[PDB]
Amino acid sequence: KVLRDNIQGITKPAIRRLARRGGVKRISGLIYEETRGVLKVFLENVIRDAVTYTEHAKRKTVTAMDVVYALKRQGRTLYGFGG
Amino acid sequence: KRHRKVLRDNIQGITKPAIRRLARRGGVKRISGLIYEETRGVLKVFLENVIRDAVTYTEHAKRKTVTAMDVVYALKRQGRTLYGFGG
Amino acid sequence: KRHRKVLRDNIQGITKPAIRRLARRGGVKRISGLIYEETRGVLKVFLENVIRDAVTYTEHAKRKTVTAMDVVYALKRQGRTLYGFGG
Amino acid sequence: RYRPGTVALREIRRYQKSTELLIRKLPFQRLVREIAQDFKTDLRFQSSAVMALQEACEAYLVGLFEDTNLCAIHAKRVTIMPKDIQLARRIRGERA
Amino acid sequence: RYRPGTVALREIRRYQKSTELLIRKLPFQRLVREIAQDFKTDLRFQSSAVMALQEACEAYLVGLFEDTNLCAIHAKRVTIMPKDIQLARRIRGER
Amino acid sequence: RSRKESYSVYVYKVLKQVHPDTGISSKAMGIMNSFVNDIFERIAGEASRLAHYNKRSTITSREIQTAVRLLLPGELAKHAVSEGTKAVTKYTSAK
Amino acid sequence: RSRKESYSVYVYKVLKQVHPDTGISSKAMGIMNSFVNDIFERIAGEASRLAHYNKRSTITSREIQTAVRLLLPGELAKHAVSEGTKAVTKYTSA
Amino acid sequence: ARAKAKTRSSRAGLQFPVGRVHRLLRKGNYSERVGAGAPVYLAAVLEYLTAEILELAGNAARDNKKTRIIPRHLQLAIRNDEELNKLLGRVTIAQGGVLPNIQAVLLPKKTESHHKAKGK
Amino acid sequence: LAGNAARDNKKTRIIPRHLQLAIRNDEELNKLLGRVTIAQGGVLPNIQAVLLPKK
DNA sequence: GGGTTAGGGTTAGGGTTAGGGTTAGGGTTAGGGTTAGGGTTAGGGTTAGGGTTAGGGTTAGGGTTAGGGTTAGGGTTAGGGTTAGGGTTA
DNA sequence: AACCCTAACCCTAACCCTAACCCTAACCCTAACCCTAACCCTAACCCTAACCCTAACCCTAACCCTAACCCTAACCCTAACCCTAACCCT
């Protein structure tokens, strides 16, 4: 739990090269806030799912297996970490 | 003299004024020209997929009658839990 | 009613005693694993882009029977003239 | 001559306030029978099955038309384009 | 003097031909820890878990940006708009 | 006569309890019957996987209570959890 | 310490059979291990529902053969079906 | 030890069957051993959901002067609540219909200025 | 604003009612003329939700 | 679930012309990029110390199962409380 | 927000096993926790080089006009195709 200086963790030049990987050439101005809000909502959902899972297992450590299972339940079968 | 099977004019079963009131239910005011063919092709592809799924299901059950339960199960497997008919 | 064999020959018949017999006339001695399958497919276009020409020719004269006089004009467009059965 | 712009909304409200079928039954049954004959011959159909098929097709068509209209109205255009359907299908992930 | 229009494509190709991480680790860990503290206190995090979280977030952001660019380029506009993200989220069914 | 299982008496009793002088229609009964069987295989199906992921095989009251917060959203999940806790308390109080 | 089940020897043997002088990497082994377990619960999971829908409880060779055409697309489904039929024929022969 | 008729089972107004779920879960190939408090929780959750759906559909049915629960009423009630729509987002009710809602940005003339002149 | 408010009633003439409807609608114009009571303009059709026959 | 014989009336399918909706051409005047410069702030080594992670006997409170009794529960059956259309009134 | 005349489907009783809910004893099998020690999360810092931040000059890009003409908007006589009972079987 830090101050409200981590929510603004997404800069502006660093997100320019991030969108360039998909094929975006020019962005805008309010994108730095809209993308941050969408990422915050999605992360709240995934964190809530992982918390419910670790509460079912009666554990206090969010492991990679629980995150993979929550992502698969949402509809994103992530590979690599876990099993 | 006494035979005949099926043809292919049934593919053009979607008219033009009848599809105008169909799109008006969702909120469409004006359509176009090639929509009558694009929508027909998309409907044909989707119906081929659903019919293939129902045929595979009725072949698993070793039946020749496509019932409503098999169609509902195939739609739920695709991602459309249809209610009303079946159980 | 009608016969259940409405398949109308799903490109079959020409199998082992036919493809091998046709290849033995040219000079083919042995046949590998695949060889077939596509052998019945390469002959589908030969009847797809030839019989359509005869149908289009018979449609111009307001007829409905593809006689032997129209099958020679379709093959002459591709570049394979046949003598004898045409006339 | 009066300006159009009111009969369309009236027809939209009338068709939205009613739950009647728009597509016929026998043509759809013949179409699905011809489609089923392409995979395996000697196949029959029922009434509830084709009814559920017609309902699912109507729902899918309504959703696709609504998505197309919502995509076209956001580009300062009251009408839709034939490419908008392919765009919506590519976004939704139906054809990739 | 090079005219603009080539450095962007060069950077795009360079970032597409490489598989390196772009977002940091400690800020993301602090962010997810602050988010987890809103539901229940006394919670910890691992390394593979936050790595998978960062990978999933990067994939989701890449997909969202690609969808936004594909929606914006079809309206005779080379740039994207803040409403295009909400439009793509409404079409995909995320809201 | 192999009769089929259907939820009709309980549905009618619930409807009469929450709304007097009311009833169900023809297709509405089949719609509710297909809706009950749909969520019946969704909530109970996740409990088996949740028990298997922890090397267990006992689906008790906590396995169903935790599955509520996963399927149900927010306010409905808390209400269902409170109702289930009150029900299990009334059950454990008197048999 | 209780060992963990992983598909490594069979994967390496298959890779050596289809491509000599080749091998697997570090994360590629975990990716393939997570990919095998994903389809393992998808094909076998549909067979149970297909057997329960017909008031049965026997998952034989036909229950897995029919599930191929549902999960796999077109050409891959026919190839997998042919491979499974040839395998069950070689098994029933000797 | 029969004594008198001890009425229970459907206690606390729980009209849902507290037992058929346990019978359907044992033979449903879900788990090897099933507990006793799980069927009670499942029945309570199902009954609460059904009661909420019925009480939210009846109020919409009474608005159109209809004391019957038609599929149109259920479709209008499910697509109205936020949580009910988020839970049943992919479910399509047969013979339901779309919610009556128009759309803005439809007239292109808006201002309708005088392109001609006052004097002919 | 008055013309835009009057064009909705199929009347191309600005009346004091249309002026009152247009003034009491914009947020920037409401804070300026908040103490101004336009004669022959009425009020705005605003009814509380508790007064309506709900459930 | 198919397949028959009336029928007939709502629905589908032939002209038509006139009004506003894309499309085509010319600056336009506001709008992103970059290369020259500098002042970082994130990319790498050395630790080391506490704050967590990770296996193992041992219960007793958490469960699982073969037997009844039985309250609650499942197909039929009326006659009445508002539900659909048709002229009126609005 | 005629609500009514039409009017059958939602409508309260009732009801006969009745098939599942509960009982009643046995078991039996399913979670902490206290020793513990190992390695991974985190805590201060140095450098220095690619990485990042900030003005000037200007060449394409989006938008607002102007005329312009061809497609989709709205009857009309139909009269073919879509329903609406009623049995009848295989």
Coordinates of all heavy atoms in Angstrom, one line a residue, chain A residues 48-49 51-53 55-59 65-66 69 72-73, chain F residues 46-47 49-51 53-54 62-64 66-67 69-71:
Chain A
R48 N -9.0 -9.7 -7.8 CA -10.1 -10.2 -7.1 C -10.3 -11.7 -7.3 O -10.6 -12.4 -6.3 CB -11.4 -9.4 -7.4 CG -12.6 -9.8 -6.6 CD -13.9 -9.5 -7.3 NE -14.0 -8.1 -7.7 CZ -14.7 -7.7 -8.8 NH1 -15.3 -8.6 -9.6 NH2 -14.6 -6.4 -9.1
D49 N -10.2 -12.1 -8.5 CA -10.3 -13.6 -8.8 C -9.1 -14.3 -8.1 O -9.4 -15.4 -7.5 CB -10.2 -13.8 -10.3 CG -11.4 -13.3 -11.0 OD1 -12.4 -12.9 -10.4 OD2 -11.4 -13.2 -12.3
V51 N -7.6 -13.4 -5.4 CA -7.8 -13.4 -4.0 C -8.9 -14.4 -3.6 O -8.7 -15.1 -2.6 CB -8.2 -11.9 -3.6 CG1 -8.9 -12.0 -2.2 CG2 -6.9 -11.1 -3.4
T52 N -9.9 -14.5 -4.4 CA -11.0 -15.5 -4.1 C -10.4 -16.9 -4.2 O -10.7 -17.8 -3.4 CB -12.1 -15.4 -5.1 OG1 -12.5 -14.0 -5.2 CG2 -13.3 -16.1 -4.6
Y53 N -9.5 -17.1 -5.2 CA -8.9 -18.5 -5.3 C -8.0 -18.8 -4.1 O -8.0 -19.9 -3.5 CB -8.1 -18.5 -6.6 CG -8.8 -19.2 -7.7 CD1 -10.2 -19.3 -7.8 CD2 -8.1 -19.9 -8.8 CE1 -10.9 -20.0 -8.8 CE2 -8.8 -20.5 -9.8 CZ -10.2 -20.6 -9.8 OH -10.8 -21.2 -10.8
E55 N -8.2 -17.6 -1.2 CA -9.0 -17.7 -0.1 C -9.7 -19.1 0.0 O -10.0 -19.6 1.0 CB -10.1 -16.6 0.0 CG -9.6 -15.3 0.7 CD -10.6 -14.3 0.8 OE1 -11.8 -14.6 0.8 OE2 -10.3 -13.1 0.8
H56 N -10.0 -19.7 -1.2 CA -10.5 -21.0 -1.3 C -9.4 -22.0 -0.8 O -9.7 -22.9 -0.1 CB -10.9 -21.4 -2.7 CG -11.8 -22.6 -2.8 ND1 -13.1 -22.6 -3.4 CD2 -11.6 -23.8 -2.3 CE1 -13.6 -23.8 -3.3 NE2 -12.8 -24.6 -2.7
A57 N -8.2 -21.8 -1.2 CA -7.1 -22.6 -0.8 C -6.5 -22.2 0.6 O -5.6 -22.9 1.1 CB -5.9 -22.5 -1.8
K58 N -7.1 -21.2 1.2 CA -6.7 -20.8 2.5 C -5.2 -20.4 2.6 O -4.5 -20.8 3.5 CB -7.0 -21.8 3.6 CG -8.4 -21.6 4.2 CD -8.5 -22.2 5.6 CE -8.9 -23.7 5.6 NZ -9.1 -24.2 7.0
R59 N -4.8 -19.7 1.5 CA -3.4 -19.3 1.4 C -3.3 -17.8 1.3 O -4.3 -17.1 0.8 CB -2.7 -19.9 0.2 CG -2.7 -21.4 0.3 CD -1.9 -22.0 -0.9 NE -2.6 -21.8 -2.2 CZ -2.2 -22.2 -3.4 NH1 -1.0 -22.8 -3.5 NH2 -2.9 -22.0 -4.4
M65 N 0.3 -20.3 -10.3 CA -0.7 -21.3 -10.7 C -2.1 -20.7 -10.6 O -3.0 -20.9 -11.4 CB -0.5 -22.6 -9.9 CG -1.3 -23.8 -10.5 SD -1.0 -25.3 -9.6 CE 0.8 -25.5 -9.9
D66 N -2.3 -20.0 -9.4 CA -3.6 -19.4 -9.2 C -3.9 -18.3 -10.3 O -5.1 -18.2 -10.7 CB -3.7 -18.8 -7.8 CG -3.8 -19.9 -6.8 OD1 -4.0 -21.1 -7.1 OD2 -3.6 -19.6 -5.6
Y69 N -4.8 -20.1 -13.5 CA -6.1 -20.7 -13.4 C -7.2 -19.6 -13.5 O -8.2 -19.8 -14.2 CB -6.3 -21.5 -12.1 CG -5.6 -22.8 -12.2 CD1 -5.3 -23.4 -11.0 CD2 -5.4 -23.5 -13.4 CE1 -4.7 -24.7 -11.0 CE2 -4.8 -24.7 -13.4 CZ -4.4 -25.3 -12.2 OH -3.8 -26.5 -12.2
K72 N -7.4 -18.5 -17.1 CA -8.0 -19.5 -18.0 C -9.6 -19.5 -17.7 O -10.3 -19.7 -18.6 CB -7.5 -20.9 -17.7 CG -7.9 -21.9 -18.7 CD -7.7 -23.3 -18.1 CE -8.5 -24.3 -18.9 NZ -8.9 -25.5 -18.0
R73 N -10.0 -19.2 -16.5 CA -11.4 -19.1 -16.2 C -12.0 -17.9 -16.8 O -13.2 -17.9 -17.3 CB -11.6 -19.0 -14.6 CG -13.1 -19.2 -14.2 CD -13.3 -18.7 -12.8 NE -13.1 -17.2 -12.7 CZ -14.1 -16.4 -12.9 NH1 -15.3 -16.8 -13.2 NH2 -13.8 -15.1 -12.7
Chain F
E46 N -17.2 -25.9 -10.8 CA -16.0 -25.2 -10.4 C -15.5 -25.7 -9.0 O -14.3 -25.7 -8.7 CB -16.3 -23.7 -10.3 CG -15.0 -22.9 -10.3 CD -14.3 -22.8 -11.6 OE1 -15.0 -22.7 -12.6 OE2 -13.1 -22.8 -11.6
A47 N -16.4 -26.2 -8.2 CA -16.0 -26.7 -6.9 C -15.2 -28.0 -7.0 O -14.2 -28.2 -6.2 CB -17.3 -27.0 -6.0
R49 N -13.1 -28.7 -9.5 CA -11.8 -28.3 -9.9 C -11.0 -27.6 -8.8 O -9.8 -27.8 -8.6 CB -11.9 -27.4 -11.2 CG -12.9 -27.9 -12.2 CD -12.5 -27.3 -13.6 NE -12.7 -25.8 -13.6 CZ -11.7 -24.9 -13.7 NH1 -10.5 -25.3 -13.8 NH2 -12.0 -23.6 -13.7
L50 N -11.8 -26.8 -8.0 CA -11.1 -26.1 -6.9 C -10.6 -27.1 -5.8 O -9.6 -26.9 -5.2 CB -12.1 -25.1 -6.3 CG -12.0 -23.7 -6.9 CD1 -13.3 -23.0 -6.7 CD2 -10.9 -22.9 -6.2
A51 N -11.4 -28.2 -5.6 CA -11.0 -29.2 -4.7 C -9.8 -30.1 -5.2 O -9.0 -30.5 -4.5 CB -12.1 -30.1 -4.3
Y53 N -7.5 -29.0 -7.3 CA -6.3 -28.2 -7.4 C -5.5 -28.1 -6.1 O -4.3 -27.9 -6.1 CB -6.7 -26.7 -7.8 CG -7.1 -26.6 -9.3 CD1 -7.8 -25.5 -9.7 CD2 -6.7 -27.6 -10.2 CE1 -8.2 -25.4 -11.0 CE2 -7.1 -27.4 -11.5 CZ -7.8 -26.4 -11.9 OH -8.2 -26.2 -13.3
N54 N -6.2 -28.4 -5.0 CA -5.6 -28.4 -3.7 C -5.3 -29.8 -3.2 O -5.1 -30.0 -2.0 CB -6.4 -27.6 -2.7 CG -6.8 -26.3 -3.2 OD1 -6.1 -25.7 -4.0 ND2 -7.9 -25.8 -2.7
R62 N -17.9 -24.6 2.5 CA -16.9 -23.6 2.1 C -16.6 -23.6 0.6 O -16.4 -22.6 0.0 CB -15.7 -23.7 3.0 CG -14.7 -22.5 2.8 CD -13.7 -22.4 4.0 NE -12.9 -21.2 3.9 CZ -12.0 -20.9 4.8 NH1 -11.8 -21.6 5.9 NH2 -11.2 -19.8 4.6
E63 N -16.6 -24.8 0.1 CA -16.4 -25.0 -1.4 C -17.5 -24.3 -2.2 O -17.2 -23.8 -3.3 CB -16.2 -26.4 -1.7 CG -14.8 -27.0 -1.5 CD -14.5 -27.3 -0.1 OE1 -15.5 -27.4 0.7 OE2 -13.3 -27.3 0.3
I64 N -18.7 -24.4 -1.7 CA -19.8 -23.7 -2.4 C -19.9 -22.3 -2.1 O -20.3 -21.4 -2.9 CB -21.2 -24.4 -2.1 CG1 -21.0 -26.0 -2.2 CG2 -22.2 -24.0 -3.0 CD1 -20.7 -26.4 -3.6
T66 N -17.3 -20.2 -1.4 CA -16.3 -19.5 -2.1 C -16.6 -19.5 -3.6 O -16.2 -18.5 -4.3 CB -14.9 -20.2 -1.9 OG1 -14.8 -20.6 -0.5 CG2 -13.8 -19.3 -2.3
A67 N -17.3 -20.4 -4.2 CA -17.7 -20.4 -5.6 C -18.7 -19.4 -5.9 O -18.9 -19.0 -7.0 CB -18.2 -21.8 -6.0
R69 N -18.6 -16.1 -4.8 CA -17.9 -14.9 -5.2 C -17.2 -15.0 -6.5 O -16.8 -13.9 -7.1 CB -16.8 -14.6 -4.1 CG -17.3 -13.5 -3.1 CD -16.1 -13.0 -2.3 NE -15.6 -14.1 -1.4 CZ -14.4 -14.0 -0.8 NH1 -13.6 -13.0 -1.0 NH2 -14.0 -15.0 0.0
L70 N -17.0 -16.2 -7.1 CA -16.4 -16.3 -8.4 C -17.4 -16.2 -9.6 O -17.1 -15.6 -10.6 CB -15.7 -17.7 -8.5 CG -14.4 -17.8 -7.7 CD1 -14.1 -19.2 -7.3 CD2 -13.2 -17.2 -8.6
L71 N -18.6 -16.8 -9.4 CA -19.6 -16.7 -10.4 C -20.5 -15.5 -10.3 O -20.7 -14.7 -11.2 CB -20.5 -18.0 -10.4 CG -21.5 -18.2 -11.6 CD1 -21.3 -19.6 -12.1 CD2 -22.9 -18.0 -11.1

